[PDB]
Write an enzyme that holds these catalytic residues in place. Structure first.
Site, PDB file in Angstrom:
ATOM      1  N   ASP A  57       7.706  -3.017   3.633  1.00 32.88           N
ATOM      2  CA  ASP A  57       7.513  -3.228   1.970  1.00 32.88           C
ATOM      3  C   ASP A  57       7.611  -2.235   1.495  1.00 32.88           C
ATOM      4  O   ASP A  57       7.105  -0.979   1.102  1.00 32.88           O
ATOM      5  CB  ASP A  57       5.410  -2.818   2.486  1.00 32.88           C
ATOM      6  CG  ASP A  57       4.629  -4.208   0.794  1.00 32.88           C
ATOM      7  OD1 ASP A  57       5.718  -4.007   0.333  1.00 32.88           O
ATOM      8  OD2 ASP A  57       3.982  -4.265   1.741  1.00 32.88           O
ATOM      9  N   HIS A 105       6.478  -7.148   1.198  1.00 30.57           N
ATOM     10  CA  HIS A 105       5.158  -7.239   0.546  1.00 30.57           C
ATOM     11  C   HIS A 105       4.885  -8.574   0.450  1.00 30.57           C
ATOM     12  O   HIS A 105       3.648  -9.413   0.827  1.00 30.57           O
ATOM     13  CB  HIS A 105       5.219  -7.448  -0.933  1.00 30.57           C
ATOM     14  CG  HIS A 105       3.636  -6.771  -1.657  1.00 30.57           C
ATOM     15  ND1 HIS A 105       2.370  -6.056  -0.192  1.00 30.57           N
ATOM     16  CD2 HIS A 105       3.286  -7.266  -2.250  1.00 30.57           C
ATOM     17  CE1 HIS A 105       1.561  -6.170  -1.139  1.00 30.57           C
ATOM     18  NE2 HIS A 105       2.058  -7.068  -2.166  1.00 30.57           N
TER      19      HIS A 105
HETATM   20  C1  LIG Z   1      -5.891 -13.989  -8.197  1.00 27.26           C
HETATM   21  S1  LIG Z   1      -3.620 -14.163  -7.759  1.00 27.26           S
HETATM   22  O1  LIG Z   1      -3.340 -15.695  -8.350  1.00 27.26           O
HETATM   23  O2  LIG Z   1      -3.891 -14.387  -6.168  1.00 27.26           O
HETATM   24  C2  LIG Z   1      -2.653 -12.958  -8.659  1.00 27.26           C
HETATM   25  C3  LIG Z   1      -2.002 -12.886  -7.758  1.00 27.26           C
HETATM   26  C4  LIG Z   1      -1.004 -11.436  -8.134  1.00 27.26           C
HETATM   27  C5  LIG Z   1      -1.355 -10.543  -8.982  1.00 27.26           C
HETATM   28  C6  LIG Z   1      -0.782  -9.881  -9.741  1.00 27.26           C
HETATM   29  N1  LIG Z   1      -1.406  -8.671 -10.739  1.00 27.26           N
HETATM   30  O3  LIG Z   1      -0.184  -7.584 -10.535  1.00 27.26           O
HETATM   31  C7  LIG Z   1       0.873  -7.528  -9.751  1.00 27.26           C
HETATM   32  C8  LIG Z   1       1.790  -7.030  -9.815  1.00 27.26           C
HETATM   33  C9  LIG Z   1       2.865  -7.430 -10.961  1.00 27.26           C
HETATM   34  C10 LIG Z   1       3.214  -8.387 -10.972  1.00 27.26           C
HETATM   35  C11 LIG Z   1       3.988  -8.494 -12.631  1.00 27.26           C
HETATM   36  C12 LIG Z   1       2.578  -9.208 -12.396  1.00 27.26           C
HETATM   37  C13 LIG Z   1       1.825  -5.997  -9.166  1.00 27.26           C
HETATM   38  N2  LIG Z   1       2.776  -4.777  -9.420  1.00 27.26           N
HETATM   39  C14 LIG Z   1       1.701  -5.993  -7.831  1.00 27.26           C
HETATM   40  F1  LIG Z   1       1.928  -6.011  -6.854  1.00 27.26           F
HETATM   41  C15 LIG Z   1       0.441  -5.183  -7.333  1.00 27.26           C
HETATM   42  C16 LIG Z   1      -0.198  -5.073  -5.230  1.00 27.26           C
HETATM   43  C17 LIG Z   1      -1.636  -4.319  -5.203  1.00 27.26           C
HETATM   44  C18 LIG Z   1      -1.668  -4.087  -6.719  1.00 27.26           C
HETATM   45  C19 LIG Z   1      -0.557  -4.443  -7.845  1.00 27.26           C
HETATM   46  N3  LIG Z   1       0.988  -8.651  -9.231  1.00 27.26           N
HETATM   47  C20 LIG Z   1      -2.532 -11.695  -9.890  1.00 27.26           C
HETATM   48 CL1  LIG Z   1      -3.408 -10.910 -11.256  1.00 27.26          CL
HETATM   49  C21 LIG Z   1      -3.556 -12.631  -9.785  1.00 27.26           C
END
Ligand SMILES: CS(=O)(=O)c1ccc(-c2noc([C@@H](CC3CC3)[C@H](N)C(F)=C3CCCC3)n2)c(Cl)c1
Ligand SMILES: CS(=O)(=O)c1ccc(-c2noc([C@@H](CC3CC3)[C@H](N)C(F)=C3CCCC3)n2)c(Cl)c1
Ligand SMILES: *[C@@H]1O[C@H](CO)[C@@H](O[C@@H]2O[C@H](CO)[C@@H](O)[C@H](O)[C@H]2NC(C)=O)[C@H](O)[C@H]1NC(C)=O
Ligand SMILES: *[C@@H]1O[C@H](CO)[C@@H](O[C@@H]2O[C@H](CO)[C@@H](O)[C@H](O)[C@H]2NC(C)=O)[C@H](O)[C@H]1NC(C)=O
Ligand SMILES: *[C@@H]1O[C@H](CO)[C@@H](O[C@@H]2O[C@H](CO)[C@@H](O)[C@H](O)[C@H]2NC(C)=O)[C@H](O)[C@H]1NC(C)=O
Ligand SMILES: *[C@@H]1O[C@H](CO)[C@@H](O[C@@H]2O[C@H](CO)[C@@H](O)[C@H](O)[C@H]2NC(C)=O)[C@H](O)[C@H]1NC(C)=O
Ligand SMILES: *[C@@H]1O[C@H](CO)[C@@H](O[C@@H]2O[C@H](CO)[C@@H](O)[C@H](O)[C@H]2NC(C)=O)[C@H](O)[C@H]1NC(C)=O
Ligand SMILES: *[C@@H]1O[C@H](CO)[C@@H](O[C@@H]2O[C@H](CO)[C@@H](O)[C@H](O)[C@H]2NC(C)=O)[C@H](O)[C@H]1NC(C)=O
Ligand SMILES: *[C@@H]1O[C@H](CO)[C@@H](O[C@H]2O[C@H](CO)[C@@H](O)[C@H](O)[C@H]2NC(C)=O)[C@H](O)[C@H]1NC(C)=O
Ligand SMILES: *[C@@H]1O[C@H](CO)[C@@H](O[C@H]2O[C@H](CO)[C@@H](O)[C@H](O)[C@H]2NC(C)=O)[C@H](O)[C@H]1NC(C)=O
Ligand SMILES: *[C@H]1O[C@H](CO)[C@@H](O[C@@H]2O[C@H](CO)[C@@H](O)[C@H](O)[C@H]2NC(C)=O)[C@H](O)[C@H]1NC(C)=O
Ligand SMILES: *[C@@H]1O[C@H](CO)[C@@H](O)[C@H](O)[C@H]1NC(C)=O
Ligand SMILES: *[C@@H]1O[C@H](CO)[C@@H](O)[C@H](O)[C@H]1NC(C)=O
Ligand SMILES: *[C@@H]1O[C@H](CO)[C@@H](O)[C@H](O)[C@H]1NC(C)=O
Ligand SMILES: *[C@@H]1O[C@H](CO)[C@@H](O)[C@H](O)[C@H]1NC(C)=O
Ligand SMILES: *[C@@H]1O[C@H](CO)[C@@H](O)[C@H](O)[C@H]1NC(C)=O
Ligand SMILES: *[C@@H]1O[C@H](CO)[C@@H](O)[C@H](O)[C@H]1NC(C)=O
Ligand code: NA
Lengths: 728, 728
Positions: free
Chosen positions: A670, A702
């Site tokens: 990851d 991941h």
């Molecule tokens: C609620 S859900 O539909 O399962 C869902 C899934 C993922 C996100 C999401 N928020 O940040 C991110 C990613 C950004 C990407 C450009 C979007 C972020 N880099 C990430 F992988 C994280 C993992 C742990 C902390 C943050 N993904 C969000 Cl807001 C909502």
């Protein structure tokens, strides 16, 4: 008795959702892949023809991964030897096929291991990145012009993003932008010279004797960030000068005073480009609008055209400052911004006037601007029925803002409440994509009269199949906490009887701006759990969640691991108080941010949950990347927010895990949430003598999405949940 | 009514065995630490005096890890700031205390981070290794002389072993050998320049933001090996003005023709040293006997004094060529070697004669030579009662080999059948250490008439405590497989009732020359399983096992993972045939080589085992180190033994794990059997869709012995076994 939706049905994808992915090649034609070959469709009448026979490349000697047609339809880019990297990045080989002469170009071929390739927006010029340097080809068969010579693996990236910009800023690997008619090529350059490296082993096939150590420039919270520079080169001068000059456009003084980021690049006209910069402390953003100076061959950004965007309650934008949509003449633009009440709406800006005018308003939000014509602006919002989890397409008259028409709301209100859209080149037509609450429905429409042209795909085949299956139902509703509405959804078992007590599984994510309660139709793990195991699978959107205003979204500013965790616990109490939940069998699970929240909840000592599963969780914010973490947490220093950084770790709650059953899972490769995060959780649990279940997934990242690992993790998790709930 | 031996008793060491570790300092006295006070004992009468007060260093300011008194009793080396490296290596800080002037030496002290230190055999000279270079101190308070200047971390090791030599050849970090009276200091130099490095992550405390990557030169099977050179330096002629001159002794030509190892260094006299070299194909060894030349100041090794040792059925020695035991004048020596029947016995060699004479013989083996005088040679063997798992001390009259006397056999036959011994300087006295089947018993004896002087420690305290506990019993017996008897042992529950059916756990190691069926008394996990859970714990020594001759030990030559695995299944099959075994509840577990066999068994498709646990297993021989692996398997090349290397992996048997419950455990910082080995097992199981249990231990190495991890692993395994056997 009808069968149920079983684990194998999910893992083997027996009930397949159909979709209709088309690619607009003009204002009235689109490409569609049918029977392995590519067809071209006339939007107005629905008639089609074969664009590229499925047998065209049978002797290509390589499996084509994807294709791309040049804007002028004269050439097709063939992608093969695809090798995935991070979320969006990958490497591949490319061949260009001449559509007219129907031959495969064999001279001056695109190099192997090319990192990114893109046609100009018009014509057939190509720009590509190879060995971290930019190259441009005016003609497919002619030699390319090198644009940069500083490219250096893991150090200098020209035209492509480094890890953190790919994942957290641009959501893309490419870092180059052609001007509208293709005369100029703008690009960013990242310097990771002083960025620390995350290192982890990659085991590979059994044949590899010594494990490989993967090393990638990755700035954890508070560490040294990559620096960035922006340049523009005139590609039309390439065949006239030995070495075309890349003109740099420097960030404003307000940004240069400290660490910053380049967060948005948008061309306004053939000679005007807009750039948005964000301070490392992400509550202050600056947009420069720069014009080409034909007499100096330079680019100048007038301060009178500079726009400031800041936030006193949180960070700027949902995940970053929003992009501007310029009117044809480039003298004005529309942009989504938070209004005075904290709701994101469309604001109309004059390029040289600092005050904008909101053209939409209400206690709901604009999700995105989808198209802009001289007379109308089209956007998606969750205004309909005050359901923050719904999405509809709207059209607003530019000459009269009071004239707003919802184009999708009433098409089929019972089956369709979540739409996305795809417009043709000049917005003459649009494809509507309904994804729930009923089976996805794809339709084609004419913009001239907003009349439906036809159904592209209705998933009748799948509807027929599901008829003979005891499918679960889904409820979307809300509860009121402190005079504010908070939405939740529940996947309910077939024949749900509210007079019975069902075991409940809280499916959580809960990161900032997240939304787990919506109207989308899904066939997933929760489906099998509700359908076959008769488990209620719930999700709740509490403080910090998105699309409901800044009051709710910024509630967790500088305080991750607090309210969003607590509200998840409070949601479980509220659900049990609904009467059909067995209080002895309440579990919780999540992936990623969801893994963190799950872990924080299981370690809170609430007593509400019996067991839980955290997959690839964050365990301490100082281990995650700078761009994402600092956006919400500020800097991990004594003068800023170090104390909360140290107080919000999963490890400090190890002792409370003695009260629950825990399953911790993580992929060893990851690159995003490092295996390190779960390695520290397990060590802390071992140190306090807490027994738990664990599973590492060798070489999975991941997404733990490889076919075999995917099947393996859900099977393993099912056994754990069934055991915790005492299910046969 | 009385309590049983519980898991907590094992983990918290409630019932402790008392020991009596003494240090002979002459032919009449020994040192023994009591109440933190070092006392000196007179062997003849048993009277003692205080040698060093426990309060002598109350203000030392450092926690003393260990001590070492110079041979002449004038100084004491104090070891502190101990930091462990591999199995034997570590670094530490040292201080020297003058016992005569009762003063702590403060001038010219040993450097911090010293890798190894050792007093000369007589007097008080010191030799230590620091930063991979050798230093000599003629006097504790005088400046040290630099002997070598080529030391380089992970590249050139002077006076210390690299990873593989430490683990597989010398069983020590030290590569320094003082001559008898301290005149000469012999040393080896290892060059690891081209040895590949194993790399793995170390997470450290939670506070470490980025994981550290540990890198160790480690030659896996078939890889480039370190090279070695041997030197001898005169420490009596060292100059504070000129650099010391080391004299090299090159290996014989039959060795220089290809890869080889230095495997033994033994001084014969003040001016004669013997060295044994082993070819990389470990079935040919050469001993050189070298004499110092006062004229030329060189060391010459006459070819007439060369001794070859080879094997046609396997490798040389149990794990390497045995050490020679020279007579006073150094003109002849005794050495354990495999005879024509394949049994290891003592051979008597003349230094300039090729044929040696065996002085012992029979279908049993000499374990080791313990002491030599002009009239007798003392040794330990398993001759008594034909029990290969028993050990007794014998002496053989050098003037008449028919005169062999067992010195420990009849001391207490019921309580004592496994002895080790410690002789005083000139063999005037000896301490016998009985370790089973009854409680350990330590006694002191006089050699002249073999009188039993006194009991030093009889563990009567523990015996009193164990009386109030329902302890399990141990049965040691044999089964016959093809006219050959193979021994096994069973730890039987309290009140064993042969009319009842008990579940059975096969505890296995089974590596070459291993012995798991013996008469040793142990308080371990198996004690708890039998006593508290009523589980029979059995162990079996099949083909490949040691101390029973080469016919048995060499049976797996070039064939690891075959007969030793098959014989465990066969034994289990036979145990299941017994009336007191529940054939529906038979499990298997092992650690290290035992984890490999356990995995190979569980993947055999035998159907005999319901479940099993493998801790830090080897999974494919190409991942283990060269010295150990090639000793048994030859080289992994198509012209040598590659096919069997590829046929003996755990991964190729993944499919067969579908009908068994498997728990795979491994420490992430295992420098010996790399985590890689289990990472590939898990990936193979995931690949064929077989579910299993796993547990990684963050930052634990091959021993998973930190206090918290130790308790956690045994707790986790106990839950797994009880679950598999349906035990409360
Ligand atoms: C609620 S859900 O539909 O399962 C869902 C899934 C993922 C996100 C999401 N928020 O940040 C991110 C990613 C950004 C990407 C450009 C979007 C972020 N880099 C990430 F992988 C994280 C993992 C742990 C902390 C943050 N993904 C969000 Cl807001 C909502
Ligand atoms: C039967 S037992 O008492 O559990 C037992 C335990 C360990 C050994 C043993 N054999 O080689 C070794 C080690 C050699 C050291 C010099 C002793 C050897 N390097 C090792 F750690 C291995 C782990 C997997 C493959 C081999 N230990 C043996 Cl022969 C017997
Ligand atoms: C869809 O059908 C129409 C009607 O046949 C096709 O229209 C052709 O349009 C071209 C202009 O590009 C005219 O020159 C022709 O007169 C039209 N066809 C004929 C036979 O006269 C159109 O090409 C079809 N589109 C696709 C993708 O098949
Ligand atoms: C990338 O950034 C690094 C700074 O970290 C630049 O390297 C420095 O370059 C200057 C100018 O030559 C030297 O004096 C320094 O010694 C360098 N410092 C380090 C840490 O290397 C590097 O030049 C930048 N590269 C580009 C293409 O902009
Ligand atoms: C094309 O022009 C660029 C810009 O002048 C050259 O790049 C510079 O090269 C010099 C020496 O090689 C370096 O000192 C500068 O740091 C470079 N600047 C930049 C912005 O990269 C490039 O070498 C030229 N290419 C050719 C073939 O002449
Ligand atoms: C694309 O836009 C560029 C920039 O406006 C055009 O290039 C300019 O063309 C005008 C003539 O109309 C010249 O006076 C300028 O010198 C050009 N500027 C530059 C920077 O080259 C270009 O003509 C447009 N391309 C097309 C196909 O219309
Ligand atoms: C240790 O043994 C060495 C070698 O036998 C002794 O050194 C020799 O001593 C004799 C007599 O004093 C000299 O004539 C030789 O020249 C010495 N040889 C060497 C190589 O030094 C040494 O004296 C002995 N040391 C002790 C403490 O007994
Ligand atoms: C030591 O073992 C090696 C390897 O088994 C023997 O060398 C040869 O090994 C190959 C297989 O790798 C066989 O084909 C040959 O028959 C072996 N002998 C020769 C001369 O090539 C070697 O014979 C063994 N040495 C002793 C003394 O037994
Ligand atoms: C053990 O007891 C003996 C007496 O039996 C002690 O005596 C010997 O050593 C003493 C000092 O070294 C001398 O004063 C005695 O003369 C000498 N006795 C004999 C018979 O030689 C001896 O030191 C004691 N040993 C210890 C370690 O305490
Ligand atoms: C340690 O071994 C290396 C060889 O592995 C010695 O260096 C030799 O090998 C080099 C390749 O790394 C060659 O480039 C050198 O020519 C060769 N050295 C010589 C003198 O020819 C190295 O010297 C050894 N170090 C010591 C102290 O013996
Ligand atoms: C090895 O480290 C110790 C501890 O640092 C050195 O001892 C002194 O320690 C004090 C404080 O404990 C420091 O102020 C000194 O700098 C240290 N050195 C001296 C000379 O006082 C010790 O000296 C070091 N050993 C060697 C050989 O350098
Ligand atoms: C295109 O190829 C597919 C398989 O490669 C084949 O089934 C199909 O018949 C071809 N298309 C048409 C229109 O026949
Ligand atoms: C790409 O690599 C393949 C295989 O190595 C080779 O045959 C081909 O010529 C290469 N093409 C280019 C443009 O380098
Ligand atoms: C931006 O955030 C920092 C940290 O909370 C704060 O000190 C500063 O005042 C903020 N700026 C604005 C405009 O809110
Ligand atoms: C030395 O200290 C220990 C404490 O660990 C104590 O038990 C012992 O009595 C002390 N020695 C003497 C001679 O009192
Ligand atoms: C000893 O050898 C080293 C290494 O070559 C050198 O640096 C040092 O000066 C030498 N000392 C003397 C006294 O020759
Ligand atoms: C003898 O027994 C062994 C196992 O002990 C077996 O492998 C072999 O086939 C049997 N027969 C012979 C001739 O060795
Ligand atoms: Na006695």
């Amino acid at each position: 008795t009808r069968k149920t939706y079983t684990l194998t049905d999910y893992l083997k994808n027996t009930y397949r959702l159909k979709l209709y992915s088309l690619r607009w090649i003009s204002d009235h034609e689109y490409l569609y892949k049918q029977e392995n070959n590519i067809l071209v469709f006339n939007a107005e009448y629905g008639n089609s023809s074969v664009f590229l026979e499925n047998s065209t490349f049978d002797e290509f000697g390589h499996s084509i991964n994807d294709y791309s047609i040049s804007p002028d339809g004269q050439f097709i880019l063939l992608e093969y030897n695809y090798v995935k990297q991070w979320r969006h990045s990958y490497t591949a080989s490319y061949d260009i096929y001449d559509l007219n002469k129907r031959q495969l170009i064999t001279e001056e071929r695109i190099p192997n291991n090319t990192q990114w390739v893109t046609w100009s927006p018009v014509g057939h010029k190509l720009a590509y990145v190879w060995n971290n340097d930019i190259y441009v080809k005016i003609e497919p068969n002619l030699p390319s012009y090198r644009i940069t010579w500083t490219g250096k693996e893991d150090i200098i990236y020209n035209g492509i993003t480094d890890w953190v910009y790919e994942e957290e800023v641009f959501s893309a690997y490419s870092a180059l932008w052609w001007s509208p008619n293709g005369t100029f090529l703008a690009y960013a350059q990242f310097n990771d010279t002083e960025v620390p490296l995350i290192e982890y082993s990659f085991y590979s096939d059994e044949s590899l004797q010594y494990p490989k150590t993967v090393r990638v420039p990755y700035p954890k919270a508070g560490a040294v960030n990559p620096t960035v520079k922006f340049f523009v080169v005139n590609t039309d001068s390439l065949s006239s000068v030995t070495n075309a000059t890349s003109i740099q456009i420097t960030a404003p003084a307000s940004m240069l005073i400290g660490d910053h980021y380049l967060c948005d690049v948008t061309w306004a006209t053939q000679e005007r480009i807009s750039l948005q910069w964000l301070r490392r402390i992400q509550n202050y953003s600056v947009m420069d609008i720069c014009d080409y100076d034909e007499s100096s061959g330079r680019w100048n950004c007038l301060v009178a055209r500079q726009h400031i965007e800041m936030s006193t309650t949180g960070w700027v934008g949902r995940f970053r400052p929003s992009e501007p949509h310029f009117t044809l003449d480039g003298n004005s633009f529309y942009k989504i911004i938070s209004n005075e009440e904290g709701y994101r709406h469309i604001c109309y800006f004059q390029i040289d006037k600092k005050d904008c005018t909101f053209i939409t308003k209400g206690t709901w939000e604009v999700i995105g601007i989808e198209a802009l014509t001289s007379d109308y602006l089209y956007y998606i919002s969750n205004e309909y029925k005050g359901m923050p989890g719904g999405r509809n397409l709207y059209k607003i008259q530019l000459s009269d803002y009071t004239k707003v028409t919802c184009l999708s709301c009433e098409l089929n209100p019972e089956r369709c409440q979540y739409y996305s859209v795809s417009f043709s080149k000049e917005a003459k037509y649009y494809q509507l994509r309904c994804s729930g609450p009923g089976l996805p429905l794809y339709t084609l429409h004419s913009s001239v009269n907003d009349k439906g042209l036809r159904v592209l795909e209705d998933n009748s085949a799948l509807d027929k199949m599901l008829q003979n299956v005891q499918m679960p139902s889904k409820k979307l509703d809300f509860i009121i906490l402190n005079e504010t509405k908070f939405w939740y959804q529940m996947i309910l078992p077939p024949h749900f009887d509210k007079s019975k007590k069902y075991p409940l599984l809280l499916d959580v994510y809960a990161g900032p701006c997240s939304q787990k309660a919506d109207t989308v139709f899904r066939l997933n793990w929760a489906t099998y759990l509700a359908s076959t195991e008769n488990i209620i699978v719930a999700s709740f959107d509490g403080r910090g969640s998105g699309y409901q205003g800044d009051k709710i979204m910024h509630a967790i500013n500088r305080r991750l691991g607090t309210f969003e965790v607590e509200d998840q616990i409070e949601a479980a109490r509220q659900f049990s108080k609904m009467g059909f939940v067995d209080n002895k069998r309440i579990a919780i699970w999540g992936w990623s941010y969801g893994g963190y929240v799950t872990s924080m909840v299981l370690g809170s000592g609430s007593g509400v949950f019996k067991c839980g599963i955290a997959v690839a969780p964050v365990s301490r914010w100082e281990y995650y990347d700078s761009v994402y973490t600092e956006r919400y947490m500020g800097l991990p220093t004594p003068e800023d927010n170090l104390d909360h950084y140290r107080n919000s770790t999963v490890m400090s709650r190890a002792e409370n895990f003695k009260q629950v059953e825990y399953l911790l899972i993580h992929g060893t490769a990851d690159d995003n949430v490092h295996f390190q995060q779960s390695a520290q959780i397990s060590k802390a649990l071992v140190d306090v003598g807490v027994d738990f279940q664990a599973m590492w997934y060798t070489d999975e990242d991941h997404g733990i999405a490889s076919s075999t690992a995917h099947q393996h993790i859900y099977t393993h998790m099912s056994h754990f949940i069934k055991q915790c709930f005492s299910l046969p």
